[PDB]
Design a protein around this nucleic acid. Structure first.
Length: 138
DNA sequence: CCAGCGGCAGC
DNA sequence: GCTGCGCGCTGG
């Protein structure tokens, strides 16, 4: 299953191949504009390229990267725990994991698995993409 | 110069 | 079903 590319160019479209990276991106976008968040996301993924590395990170280091985005303490701790649960819990949907709610779960179910027809997003950008998918389906 | 704004956990 | 977390951005 490969989610098709869209005219909205959501970052999920280029990260769906790695569920952990896609979900980290959704966390970076919590109450944070993509214009601010996504540049720092590339910085985060360089210093921490996988759940295995991020699980062992000092949350203070992560916080330093997140500082100018806001919500730098909460989310730094969330990212570490989420990355640990991502590899230790035997989840089917990432909503089961700490730090992922409906928005991250809707993203996973549209981009990482072929479940977009079962999804009813409430995020604006997800809705743009999902509405376009129902249109151009066939 | 100023204030409104861009998910999720926990209780 | 309510609150805290939070910065730089942006328009006026």
């Amino acid at each position: 299953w490969t989610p098709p590319r869209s005219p909205f160019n959501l970052v999920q479209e280029t990260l769906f191949h790695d569920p952990w990276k896609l979900l980290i991106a959704t966390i970076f976008l919590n109450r944070t504009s993509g214009k601010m968040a996504i540049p720092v996301l590339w910085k985060f993924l360089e210093k921490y390229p996988s759940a295995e590395v991020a699980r062992t990170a000092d949350w203070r280091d992560v916080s330093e990267l997140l500082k100018p985005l806001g919500l730098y303490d909460l989310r730094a701790k969330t990212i570490v725990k989420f990355s640990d649960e991502y590899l230790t819990k035997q989840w089917k949907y990432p909503i089961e994991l700490h730090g992922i709610g409906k928005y991250g779960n809707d993203s996973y179910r549209i981009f990482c698995v072929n479940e977009w027809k079962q999804v009813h997003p409430e995020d604006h950008k997800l809705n743009k993409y999902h509405d376009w998918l129902w249109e151009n389906h066939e």
